[PDB]
Design a binder for these strands. Structure first.
Lengths: 335, 22, 49, 63, 181, 44, 129, 50, 134, 58, 92, 114
RNA sequence: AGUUCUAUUGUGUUAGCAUGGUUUCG
RNA sequence: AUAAGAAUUAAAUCUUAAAAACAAUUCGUUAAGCAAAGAAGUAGAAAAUAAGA
């Protein structure tokens, strides 16, 4: 009985993002046994399910284009340094686990898998494969319309792009609004910008090679002066161009290349979790012990401690559901 | 103008003649 | 220059942190005048000084 | 005093700008943050200033 | 907040003192261990002559040179240093440990350590003053007068009864000369 | 018929996305069961 | 949506506060009662076309100045013969014409108008917020 | 690449690091974890079981 | 169930004819000259007709080539077809000049030769005399 | 204590830029704040932006 | 620097127009004319003062004309001052 | 007074030449009462443009070195003149070390926020 | 207001340098 | 003489010329003296200079 992930999530688009709805428990635990019982009972009730439970309504434009623009602006103001996105992995922070609307999605996927396997049992494997291909095509078609704030939604619903009301190009400094990337660049790391920050100076120089004005860079006056000095010194040292933006090979900061490599591998292992980056950092830890691995080691320790805490919690639950989970609500509210 | 150019032309001619002689 | 002014202050001060008493002010102004005179003897073209 | 109280409350709770986002009167663009008297931000700052007049500190009134 | 590992940190009574970072020399490691032992101080230390043999045996078990042997012997034979003595004396003064302060002050005053006068003079004077003040009997004013004059670089501010009874560049540099701590 | 109230707009964004995904799955399941019924009727 | 100066100071309106409005009502009630206690007295009402169609645009008071040399002349000069009370709803618009008018004037206006043109208090005799 | 504009004689320290890494992590092994980073681990800690 | 409880009257959702930014008042003639430059750079298409120039070009090309016009005149033919399809139902614009539209907003500064008109009184005055006695 | 404020008269005068084609400041620079000037808070109502550096030390 | 444009699946006239736009927004012709002949310092003072006074006015009037064109295109009506105390309640 | 010096040697420069230059710089530091703090190699880096060094040739990259030293302010002019006179060195720059943004302390996570 | 220290310096004098109009050389 | 370059409202002076090293255009390399193109809103604190025509 192939599941939804077994059937359809091996495609590129479908397999890209795959949220987790339930904790994974190793075979031989009370959680695993209860999950098995629930799956069996749910499959049997799917067999003895009525027609009214699969009623669906036609899809319509969730938002107008102007309302989408307003929502995007408000989300950006909420998170001015980061990009707005449906962080369905961080979902638990915003929506309480008990009120997750994705349990319906999980159960519907289970039902679709059961329906497809029964159809294969009845009509034939070739027809089942035809239907699986058709369902894959439909999922690919409907992949990019789920997000009301995406361009896929607009394209699917055939809505013309909004024509925003004109705004002034020359406004007061009070209203200047940089993009998140320019904002991160300008803030640097809470440190004034130096010529050694060759990874960022490209933002404040135009394609013509001329240094951008303050109205364009959206930098404070002190920051503008610091950036001008940094660019002038880099140019005099011949690590920054004079008449164009730096080549992609010139973007390393003025620092130790091996420390840069360690930083990049740590960033990869934290953002996505590259096992290759983890192995490279592990070997570098001993091969070059004169570099700085504080963040990498701290993340490793945090993960190990979280694993130990989860194991202790599982042992407590096996002995009997203890007051930890109840506290996560009652004690948190009392605090 | 018409002084530096003439002087430099004469200088180049003299230098070429001397180098050829040498 | 700051070290020399500190020494004069410790010589002529009311108490450990007294730097505004007129005696200490006189000492510091004298030291500053001497420093600027030396700087002018070097950079004789520095008119603002 | 609302000019600063509203900024403080918005910086603590950015999500208050969603409320009545489509209603004329609430200007949430950067550099303005001027809400209607019936906006949650305005009610919050009004209650805080009322408590301050009653004689509490800014932080106590905020809490 | 260790930049890298493995590392050896040393805390002197809940206070960071030194950190030996990864990839250090054997001589540096031995100096670290010796300094830790000195600061801390049945129990004994290997002789500085045999320190090289001990290190070689430890290396063999875990798995010498003419200059390495001499360096190890000298490092292990060195006595306490200015940083250790000053830190110990400061902590003892803050803890009002009379006997400690006394012993540490005597060690610092020892003649062989006179080379470190420029670094130890103020601490020595203030240790003497603190001992005199903390003495159970009321402080002797005559004794206090000498130390106070030494510290202040003068005796014009003391009570009268307790007071004890050429070149251009030289003359113009004498102005900035004050002899108090 | 009655849906919950959240404190942030992120929650409503994800709620709407989940609703759309569930409705698409419902359409697929209904079509599959209709095909099931048609096949059963044809066989019988 | 806005790219202009943001004011930092708000001015109170004592003339149009609750107690001041109550006093305005109390003082105007007595004058209105006394006026109505006398017979054959008409009250003129002036407003703006955008705040009132049915209302006539011409009356006895209106003078309808037509010459350039008569620009300075008021248009409500003769209202005193016919009327014993002018109830005005556009004091800002009619200020130059209600100035030193020989009949009592009861003006209705907003605190914003009063503060932006305080000179209307020199042409208004009774105020009803 | 041009011989008169490129860099030659440099160590391939990164390639050596990759080759040594192959020892701890087989080259024919998974490229990611079950939970892909901070966000995935947050999801794991914030999803309930049955 | 949950949803907005007030009208979606936001001026972004319902754009309105207004200047959202103020600016120190400009001399009237300077502003007029700047607006004239802007209009010239835009080339307001108030010509006899957008299709007239395309037709003229097509006819001139046909006259120049009386034999091989079938192959010569194809770019012109496509341009004329596009112009007919786009501006076929073309009506000359009937609106006030931007100069007057901005005088309405009071953007400019009164000079010696330009003054804003005084508020209308004759047209706006509405009088209602009623009896008030007894 | 009740003490009057000090005078707003300062030595040297006001910034002057040398006449001619040099561009040199005969006295003071372009960032000079005159004594008769409003407060910094008055002149900069917004205050530091969210992307400015909290610590200005280099 | 020198702007480089690739004439690919486009008209050479269009690419030349883009190059002209780049030159105009970079003031290349202005600088060439300035350096072709000597400008005395006082003339430069007057010119810079004139430009600094003039261009903001042009930008504001450009914004105004853009708003006018948008309103004419979208048949927008003149605004009325938002009356406060309006409940702004849906008629539903 | 603490300073940091950055040098860009050409490919023609050798380890022996680098050692000789560093020895000369430390000699100047000691003469001016200073002390060399640290020396580091920042690897081979391509130049943003071709360096046409007169009477030496044309180069398209360089090896970057850094050394930090405390010395009397009077030593900087001599050090700069010596580095300028040196042939192999393509470019050099000496600055006053800063409390926060210096290669001694602000040496990691200059580009990676997390 | 003044003195000392503190963080910052498109201010004035400074040895040298990176870049560039122009002229120059082939 | 003449053409070309250059320039001009249009011309002329001027430079080169007959296969070219420096009249003019294109490409490299140094050399010399010289040095505010690019980065700061005289705007926004209520902050406002002179009865009238």
């Amino acid at each position: 009985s192939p599941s939804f992930e077994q059937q359809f999530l091996n495609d590129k688009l479908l397999g890209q993002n795959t949220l987790q709805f339930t904790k994974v428990s190793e075979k031989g635990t009370a959680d695993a046994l209860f999950a098995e019982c629930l799956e069996s009972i749910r499959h049997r009730r799917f067999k003895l399910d009525p027609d009214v439970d699969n009623r669906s309504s036609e899809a319509v434009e969730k938002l107008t284009q102007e309302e989408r623009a307003i929502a995007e602006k408000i989300f950006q103001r909420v998170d001015p340094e980061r990009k707005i996105a449906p962080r369905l992995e961080s979902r638990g922070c915003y929506i309480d686990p008990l009120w997750d609307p994705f349990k319906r999605v999980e159960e519907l996927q289970q039902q679709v898998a059961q329906d497809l396997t029964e159809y294969a049992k009845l009509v034939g494997a070739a027809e089942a494969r035809r239907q699986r291909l058709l369902v894959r095509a439909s999922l690919r078609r409907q992949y990019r319309m789920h997000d009301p704030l995406s361009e896929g939604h607009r394209r699917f619903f055939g809505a013309q792009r909004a024509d925003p009301f004109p705004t002034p190009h020359r406004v007061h400094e009070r209203f200047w609004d940089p993009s998140p990337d320019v904002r991160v660049a300008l803030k640097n790391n809470n440190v004034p910008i130096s010529w050694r920050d060759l990874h960022i100076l490209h933002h404040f120089v135009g394609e013509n090679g001329l240094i951008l004005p303050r109205r364009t860079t959206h930098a404070s006056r002190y920051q503008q002066r610091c950036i001008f000095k940094a660019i002038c010194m880099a140019r005099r040292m011949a690590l920054f161009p004079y008449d164009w933006k730096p080549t992609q090979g010139e973007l390393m900061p003025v620092m130790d290349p091996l420390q840069y490599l360690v930083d990049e591998l740590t960033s990869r292992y934290k953002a996505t979790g590259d096992l290759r980056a983890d192995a490279m950092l592990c070997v570098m830890l001993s091969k070059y012990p004169k570099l700085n691995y504080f963040r990498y080691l701290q993340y490793k320790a945090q993960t190990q401690k979280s694993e130990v805490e989860a194991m202790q919690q599982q042992e407590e639950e096996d002995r009997g559901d203890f007051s930890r989970l109840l506290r996560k609500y009652k004690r948190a509210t009392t605090d | 103008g018409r002084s530096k150019v003439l002087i430099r032309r004469l200088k180049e001619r003299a230098k070429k003649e001397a180098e050829k002689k040498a | 220059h700051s070290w020399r002014k500190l020494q004069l202050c410790r010589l002529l001060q009311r108490r450990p942190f007294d730097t505004g008493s007129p005696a200490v002010q006189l000492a510091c102004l004298t030291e500053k005048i001497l420093n600027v005179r030396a700087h002018l003897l070097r950079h004789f073209r520095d008119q603002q000084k | 005093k609302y000019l600063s109280l509203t900024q403080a409350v918005l910086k603590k709770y950015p999500n208050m700008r969603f409320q009545d986002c489509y209603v004329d009167g609430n200007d949430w663009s950067k550099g303005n943050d001027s809400y209607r008297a019936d906006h949650p931000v305005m009610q919050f700052v009004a209650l805080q200033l009322r408590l301050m007049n009653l004689g509490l500190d800014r932080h106590a009134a905020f809490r | 907040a260790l930049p890298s590992v493995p590392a050896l940190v040393c805390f002197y009574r809940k206070k960071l003192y030194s950190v030996l970072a990864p990839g250090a020399s054997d001589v540096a490691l031995l100096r670290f261990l010796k300094e830790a032992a000195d600061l801390s101080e049945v129990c004994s230390r290997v002789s500085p002559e045999n320190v090289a043999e001990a290190v070689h045996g430890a290396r063999v078990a875990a798995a010498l040179t003419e200059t390495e042997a001499v360096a190890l012997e000298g490092a292990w034979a060195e006595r306490k240093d200015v940083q250790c003595l000053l830190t110990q004396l400061g902590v003892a003064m803050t803890r009002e440990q009379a006997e400690e302060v006394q012993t540490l002050k005597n060690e610092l005053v020892a003649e062989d350590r006179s080379e470190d006068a420029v670094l130890t003079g103020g601490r020595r004077l203030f240790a003497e003053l603190q001992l005199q003040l903390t003495g159970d009997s009321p402080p002797d004013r005559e004794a206090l007068s000498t130390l106070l004059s030494d510290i202040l670089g003068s005796a014009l501010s003391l009570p009268e009864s307790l007071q004890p009874p050429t070149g251009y560049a030289e003359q113009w540099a004498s102005l900035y000369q004050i002899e108090g701590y | 018929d009655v849906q919950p109230l959240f404190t942030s707009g992120q929650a409503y964004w994800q709620f709407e996305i989940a609703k759309s995904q569930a409705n698409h799955l419902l359409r697929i399941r209904s079509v599959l069961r209709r095909m099931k019924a048609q096949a059963e009727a044809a066989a019988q | 949506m806005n790219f202009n100066r943001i004011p930092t100071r708000l001015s109170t309106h004592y003339v149009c506060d609750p107690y001041t409005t109550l006093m305005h009502y109390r003082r105007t009630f007595k004058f209105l009662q006394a006026l109505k206690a006398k017979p054959n007295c008409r009250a003129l009402c002036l407003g703006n076309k955008n705040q009132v169609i049915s209302w006539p645009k011409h009356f006895d008071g209106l003078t309808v100045v037509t010459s350039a040399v008569a620009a300075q002349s008021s248009i409500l000069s003769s209202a005193s013969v016919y009327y014993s009370l002018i109830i005005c709803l556009d004091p800002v618009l009619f200020a130059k014409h209600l100035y030193r008018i020989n009949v009592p004037v009861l003006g209705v206006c907003t605190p914003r108008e009063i503060h932006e043109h305080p000179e209307i208090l020199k042409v208004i005799d009774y105020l009803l917020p | 690449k041009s011989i008169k504009k490129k860099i030659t004689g440099t160590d391939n320290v990164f390639r050596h690091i990759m080759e040594e890494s192959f020892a701890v992590l087989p080259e024919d092994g998974p490229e990611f974890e079950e939970d892909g980073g901070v966000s995935a681990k947050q999801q794991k800690s914030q999803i309930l079981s049955e | 169930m949950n949803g907005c409880s007030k009208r979606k009257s936001h001026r972004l959702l319902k754009p309105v004819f207004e200047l959202q930014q103020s600016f120190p008042k400009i001399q009237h003639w300077q502003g007029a000259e700047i607006l004239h430059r802007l209009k010239q750079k835009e080339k307001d298409a108030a010509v006899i007709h957008p299709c007239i120039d395309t037709w003229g070009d097509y006819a001139q090309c046909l006259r120049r080539y009386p034999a091989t016009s079938a192959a010569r005149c194809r770019v012109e033919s496509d341009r004329h077809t596009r112009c007919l399809q786009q501006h076929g139902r073309w009506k000359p614009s009937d609106s006030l000049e931007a100069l007057k539209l901005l005088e309405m907003f009071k953007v400019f500064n009164e000079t010696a030769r330009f003054k804003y008109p005084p508020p209308p009184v004759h047209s706006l005055v509405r009088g209602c005399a009623f009896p008030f006695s007894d | 204590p009740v003490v009057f404020p000090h005078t707003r008269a300062r030595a040297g005068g006001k910034p002057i830029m040398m006449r001619g084609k040099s561009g040199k400041w005969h006295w003071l620079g372009p960032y000079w704040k005159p004594p008769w000037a409003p407060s910094n808070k008055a002149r900069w109502p917004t205050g530091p932006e969210e992307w400015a550096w909290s610590d200005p030390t280099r | 620097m020198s702007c480089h444009r690739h004439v690919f699946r486009a008209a050479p006239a269009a690419v030349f127009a883009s190059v002209q736009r780049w030159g105009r927004r970079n003031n290349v012709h202005k600088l060439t004319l300035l350096v072709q002949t000597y400008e005395k310092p006082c003339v430069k003072r007057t010119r810079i003062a004139e430009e600094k006074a003039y261009y903001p006015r042009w930008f504001y009037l450009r914004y105004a004309t853009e708003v006018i064109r948008y309103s004419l295109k979208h048949h927008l009506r003149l605004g009325q001052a938002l009356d406060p105390n309006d409940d702004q309640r849906l008629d539903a | 007074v603490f300073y940091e010096t950055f040098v860009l040697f050409s490919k023609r420069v050798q380890r022996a030449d680098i050692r000789q230059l560093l020895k000369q710089q430390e000699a100047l530091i000691t003469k001016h009462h200073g002390s060399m703090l640290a020396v580091r190699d920042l690897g081979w880096r391509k130049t943003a443009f071709r360096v046409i060094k007169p009477r030496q040739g044309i180069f398209w990259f360089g090896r970057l070195f850094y050394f930090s030293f405390g010395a009397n302010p009077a030593a900087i002019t001599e050090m700069s003149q010596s580095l300028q006179s040196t042939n192999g060195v393509l470019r050099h720059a000496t600055v006053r070390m800063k409390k926060r943004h210096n290669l001694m302390t602000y040496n990691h996570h200059i580009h990676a926020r997390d």
